[PDB]
Design a protein around this ligand. Sequence first.
Ligand SMILES: Nc1nc2c(ncn2[C@@H]2O[C@H](COP(=O)(O)OP(=O)(O)NP(=O)(O)O)[C@@H](O)[C@H]2O)c(=O)[nH]1
Ligand SMILES: Nc1nc2c(ncn2[C@@H]2O[C@H](COP(=O)(O)OP(=O)(O)NP(=O)(O)O)[C@@H](O)[C@H]2O)c(=O)[nH]1
Ligand SMILES: Nc1nc2c(ncn2[C@@H]2O[C@H](COP(=O)(O)OP(=O)(O)NP(=O)(O)O)[C@@H](O)[C@H]2O)c(=O)[nH]1
Ligand SMILES: Nc1nc2c(ncn2[C@@H]2O[C@H](COP(=O)(O)OP(=O)(O)NP(=O)(O)O)[C@@H](O)[C@H]2O)c(=O)[nH]1
Ligand SMILES: Nc1nc2c(ncn2[C@@H]2O[C@H](COP(=O)(O)OP(=O)(O)NP(=O)(O)O)[C@@H](O)[C@H]2O)c(=O)[nH]1
Ligand SMILES: Nc1nc2c(ncn2[C@@H]2O[C@H](COP(=O)(O)OP(=O)(O)NP(=O)(O)O)[C@@H](O)[C@H]2O)c(=O)[nH]1
Ligand SMILES: O=C(NC[C@@H]1COc2ccccc2O1)c1ccco1
Ligand SMILES: O=C(NC[C@@H]1COc2ccccc2O1)c1ccco1
Ligand SMILES: O=C(NC[C@@H]1COc2ccccc2O1)c1ccco1
Ligand SMILES: O=C(NC[C@@H]1COc2ccccc2O1)c1ccco1
Ligand SMILES: O=C(NC[C@@H]1COc2ccccc2O1)c1ccco1
Ligand SMILES: [Mg+2]
Ligand SMILES: [Mg+2]
Ligand SMILES: [Mg+2]
Ligand SMILES: [Mg+2]
Ligand SMILES: [Mg+2]
Ligand SMILES: [Mg+2]
Lengths: 172, 172, 172, 173, 172, 173
Amino acid sequence: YFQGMTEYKLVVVGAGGVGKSALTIQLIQNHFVDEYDPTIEDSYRKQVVIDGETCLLDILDTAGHEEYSAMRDQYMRTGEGFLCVFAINNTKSFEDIHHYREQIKRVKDSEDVPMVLVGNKCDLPSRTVDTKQAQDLARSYGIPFIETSAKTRQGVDDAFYTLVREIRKHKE
Amino acid sequence: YFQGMTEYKLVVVGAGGVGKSALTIQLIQNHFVDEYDPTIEDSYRKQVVIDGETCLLDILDTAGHEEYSAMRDQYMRTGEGFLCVFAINNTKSFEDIHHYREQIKRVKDSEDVPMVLVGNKCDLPSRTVDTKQAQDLARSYGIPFIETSAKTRQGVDDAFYTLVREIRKHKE
Amino acid sequence: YFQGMTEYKLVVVGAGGVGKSALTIQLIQNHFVDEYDPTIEDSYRKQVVIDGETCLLDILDTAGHEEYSAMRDQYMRTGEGFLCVFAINNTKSFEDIHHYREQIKRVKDSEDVPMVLVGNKCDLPSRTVDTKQAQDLARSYGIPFIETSAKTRQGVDDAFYTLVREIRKHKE
Amino acid sequence: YFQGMTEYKLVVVGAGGVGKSALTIQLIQNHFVDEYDPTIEDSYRKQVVIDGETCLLDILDTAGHEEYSAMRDQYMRTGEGFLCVFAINNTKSFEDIHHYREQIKRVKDSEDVPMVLVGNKCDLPSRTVDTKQAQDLARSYGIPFIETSAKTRQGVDDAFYTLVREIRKHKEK
Amino acid sequence: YFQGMTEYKLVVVGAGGVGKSALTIQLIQNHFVDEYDPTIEDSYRKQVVIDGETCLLDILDTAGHEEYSAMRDQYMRTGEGFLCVFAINNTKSFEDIHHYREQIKRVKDSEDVPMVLVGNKCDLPSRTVDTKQAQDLARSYGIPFIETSAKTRQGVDDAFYTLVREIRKHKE
Amino acid sequence: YFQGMTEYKLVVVGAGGVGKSALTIQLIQNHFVDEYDPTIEDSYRKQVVIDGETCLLDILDTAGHEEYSAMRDQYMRTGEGFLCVFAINNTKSFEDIHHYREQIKRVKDSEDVPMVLVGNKCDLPSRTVDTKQAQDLARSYGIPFIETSAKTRQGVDDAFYTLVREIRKHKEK
Ligand SMILES: Nc1nc2c(ncn2[C@@H]2O[C@H](COP(=O)(O)OP(=O)(O)NP(=O)(O)O)[C@@H](O)[C@H]2O)c(=O)[nH]1
Ligand SMILES: Nc1nc2c(ncn2[C@@H]2O[C@H](COP(=O)(O)OP(=O)(O)NP(=O)(O)O)[C@@H](O)[C@H]2O)c(=O)[nH]1
Ligand SMILES: Nc1nc2c(ncn2[C@@H]2O[C@H](COP(=O)(O)OP(=O)(O)NP(=O)(O)O)[C@@H](O)[C@H]2O)c(=O)[nH]1
Ligand SMILES: Nc1nc2c(ncn2[C@@H]2O[C@H](COP(=O)(O)OP(=O)(O)NP(=O)(O)O)[C@@H](O)[C@H]2O)c(=O)[nH]1
Ligand SMILES: Nc1nc2c(ncn2[C@@H]2O[C@H](COP(=O)(O)OP(=O)(O)NP(=O)(O)O)[C@@H](O)[C@H]2O)c(=O)[nH]1
Ligand SMILES: Nc1nc2c(ncn2[C@@H]2O[C@H](COP(=O)(O)OP(=O)(O)NP(=O)(O)O)[C@@H](O)[C@H]2O)c(=O)[nH]1
Ligand SMILES: O=C(NC[C@@H]1COc2ccccc2O1)c1ccco1
Ligand SMILES: O=C(NC[C@@H]1COc2ccccc2O1)c1ccco1
Ligand SMILES: O=C(NC[C@@H]1COc2ccccc2O1)c1ccco1
Ligand SMILES: O=C(NC[C@@H]1COc2ccccc2O1)c1ccco1
Ligand SMILES: O=C(NC[C@@H]1COc2ccccc2O1)c1ccco1
Ligand SMILES: [Mg+2]
Ligand SMILES: [Mg+2]
Ligand SMILES: [Mg+2]
Ligand SMILES: [Mg+2]
Ligand SMILES: [Mg+2]
Ligand SMILES: [Mg+2]
């Protein structure tokens, strides 16, 4: 019997200051946060319809730099899909993506974990990471790539919905 | 790729005056039709969410007594699920059910066609068909039975949603 | 910041066979379950709007007779509000109500636990519990009383929504 | 040109105790009010979809017996459609309907005011007004008749939605 | 009597590669398609609310590279309104709008067909068609102009909704 | 007892041509108005959900330059919250903001009126008001600042929703 909507546990990861919180708050509250208030751990929920199916998104917004490592392992084990976020004006955040992806694969003991690569801050003019380099990286992982802006909303719904679609593909 | 909601083609059949139209209009318009205006053929649409899936119901309301028999065969071939309606104060309408069911199975060349047995007018005091007799008939067919009232709305959404659930079970 | 809708943890309690599951399934699925399948423990969820506020209902459907008593204490501690259900044609289930209420107050160590008294099966003709006696019982507890039918849907939404309203009053 | 949904100003009238408030509260809150708390004047709002059109219902719940008569005239002038409610177990409330209808036509200075006749408390066994008599009365006025119960919800949405449909028919003539 | 929502048959036309499919998929899926997969003929549906009226959009996505087909004329004649799409960085696509407008008038056998002029890819730096030139063209036809980006979503809902508004104006 | 959704009376003010109407029509109709049709006074409504609470926005779109002054005073008294709009390519419109805020405070006889500063036309290239100057101004007033574009929709929902959030904060003090 149907016991209520499907829930998806989504985790947003990436380096400090890339816009993990701003992405999530834009999704939930339709609000752009201009301030930089570093996150420890915050959880949000939103019911949405994707490809005709109602679902409840449970979104965990993580800290760029996780001090205690057992807490990080716990959210990686609980997460069903991951947004791996870098900022298109921060080359170091892009170089860090490989580390986040390896950490997730290690903790979940899986090679095929639903993930989407997200290049955020696409509204800003001083781009240091080229679209082609990110697309190549995503292709090498077999995952989608989406450019976003938490300020203009470009790609925000698409990033989260794409991740749900990746989870659903993996569940069949 | 998703191109739009799933559509379900539902056909409402049964003897003259059992409340086929009244059931459908209660579903679509939240309106009870007190008048008895015999139907020739009418089609209705409604988008609903059932078990978290969005769907488009295409509902064909049929005549109690079909003049052209080729037109009847055509809607039987086209329909994916059937509500077989009798009135709980009309014994003849209940005895007629087996004819509608045989016609449908013949045309579809199948013993497992999605169907729901509907005992309508359950608000009226003059009952001549017992719940147990209808339940036994439905059990013999392997289909659900639901008592309805187009006037009180008892069972109306449930009849249609149950039929969609029967179609989905058959498709998988 | 708002992190998504408010969640309410609702627990449905009462004697065996009074319609705990049937009420919950009518709420969630718009479906009347005619079969009597005794419950061990089932959980359901639904998003609804009550008094203009969006909320997520988490509903725990319990067994009439709880064997292991630590498991019962655990759901009573976790529940924020309780529907105490009897059947209007079952005097014993009505006389039992005070036991359920005492068990809840004992475990929660409180005299002011959000609760609603529910008299189910109000569609049936064989009534043995008078509405006035139920209202008097509810008045003695300081809680609302609602007559319901899981078959007709009378009062079903009202029972759950009223319970949410009781929870909100207690939280403020 | 479109400035937001269409608004319909609905007024609920009828004798004391027929269930005007209970109908409205069932519509708005999905709650049956068992208590009898006499109304002075209350206003409620709900956004609904009727025949594919989104609309905002502004509903004025009136007192059975109106003290100040200028205030009654004011809501009758402002109202676009009226639910005229009686209780099916209260013959006197049914006999009163013609007075409410006449008062509305007088104030609005019109013979063609959108209205629906509502026979409430249809869940109760003690019926004293026959459906044939109510149907005849409604036919004589050229308006719909609907039996309702604020307790079971029978006919509640239908009464209000039917009234909106009557208003729309009148606006298109 | 109301039998369910109004349906509008929309057709999206324009030169190869202008973003007809990308616009439609952004509408339906909230997804930007980066790949260029040439279309032959694809159909989508979506229920939306426009000016307070619920409607069902039936959307036909066409080929931009297609020699003369009787089969093309046949599907175009089902259209009630047309999005005529060019890319703001492709002057030839803008000059081709005259050909699509003549094709539509020919197939519909009418001078007054609901249409909207859509200038897509407004996010790109390589603009060759100025806003004022497109506005002047649209004014000459007596139709609206909307600038869009299937990547940012600028103007996507507005293009389709505007077309529905044009259809409604024509029907009254 | 709940009688239907809460209504918020929002007023959009600012110099002529800054995009007051364009913002409102983007919110209501999802439509970008490219034409410049100067407003006299128009009212719009929209039901929205903000922070899980359903509400009805009643939005008054005002004229840049209000000729008869009693009509302006009346909407300022009635309004619960104000969007103060300038265009990021029009320095004069930004210099006007302080005066619109003072006019609102004078009419309402209060120092603490819910308001949001809106910098519109952020899609256009010829910016003359820098983000930092607007943020500083907003900070000096203790109000939020949001950059918007009625063309791209950037910030449109956020401006209106933020204003409702400011009204709710003020009602809870
Ligand atoms: N222009 C622009 N600024 C952005 C965007 N996303 C985030 N920002 C800004 O970048 C800063 C950091 O954003 P924030 O959400 O807090 O980043 P975070 O990744 O959650 N940081 P942490 O790891 O400390 O929790 C903030 O000043 C924010 O406004 C964007 O897409 N565009
Ligand atoms: N009391 C009550 N009356 C009902 C109910 N359903 C239908 N009726 C009434 O029964 C009569 C016949 O209803 P109708 O829907 O037209 O029947 P039908 O099966 O569509 N007739 P046909 O086959 O000629 O199209 C109408 O007067 C209607 O008001 C019900 O559930 N309860
Ligand atoms: N007529 C009618 N029958 C009802 C209603 N509610 C429940 N029933 C019936 O009463 C029986 C028991 O219902 P059920 O929901 O299983 O009760 P329960 O309280 O969950 N049983 P348990 O404690 O064993 O889990 C079933 O046959 C069901 O159809 C009602 O409102 N009216
Ligand atoms: N059984 C049943 N009782 C009803 C129904 N509608 C109203 N009642 C009851 O009848 C009483 C009067 O209802 P109420 O809504 O206050 O009537 P009213 O017409 O608003 N009275 P007034 O004009 O004084 O404001 C209440 O006790 C209420 O529970 C109904 O449909 N069925
Ligand atoms: N940057 C940008 N690229 C776009 C935009 N719309 C479409 N594209 C890109 O342009 C290419 C062609 O788009 P597509 O939608 O397939 O074009 P079409 O008009 O459907 N082509 P056909 O007629 O062959 O079906 C794709 O690579 C797509 O990503 C847009 O608004 N901006
Ligand atoms: N590019 C761009 N143009 C805009 C934007 N907002 C408004 N405009 C344009 O600026 C002009 C004025 O907008 P309008 O909404 O009428 O301004 P207003 O503040 O309501 N004027 P008034 O005070 O006379 O009523 C219009 O041509 C409109 O298209 C925007 O965000 N971006
Ligand atoms: O709810 C929280 N975290 C608990 C878990 C961890 O992993 C999760 C992974 C994905 C989504 C939700 C998760 O929820 C939380 C922290 C701070 C506030 O809420
Ligand atoms: O719609 C109609 N017929 C076409 C077909 C028939 O079978 C169907 C079966 C189920 C649902 C729709 C159907 O539509 C129709 C004739 C008269 C009024 O509507
Ligand atoms: O859901 C479950 N338990 C977790 C908790 C306990 O207390 C609850 C109290 C109220 C509502 C839900 C509850 O859910 C559960 C076990 C087995 C099936 O569902
Ligand atoms: O709301 C009130 N009156 C003002 C007007 C009158 O006519 C109306 C007609 C229909 C809907 C609302 C109306 O509102 C009111 C007084 C007391 C409580 O509410
Ligand atoms: O609606 C109007 N005025 C009445 C009032 C005034 O202040 C208001 C402030 C905010 C929202 C609605 C208001 O509406 C109106 C005149 C012209 C067009 O609409
Ligand atoms: Mg953060
Ligand atoms: Mg019929
Ligand atoms: Mg049970
Ligand atoms: Mg009252
Ligand atoms: Mg294509
Ligand atoms: Mg204006």
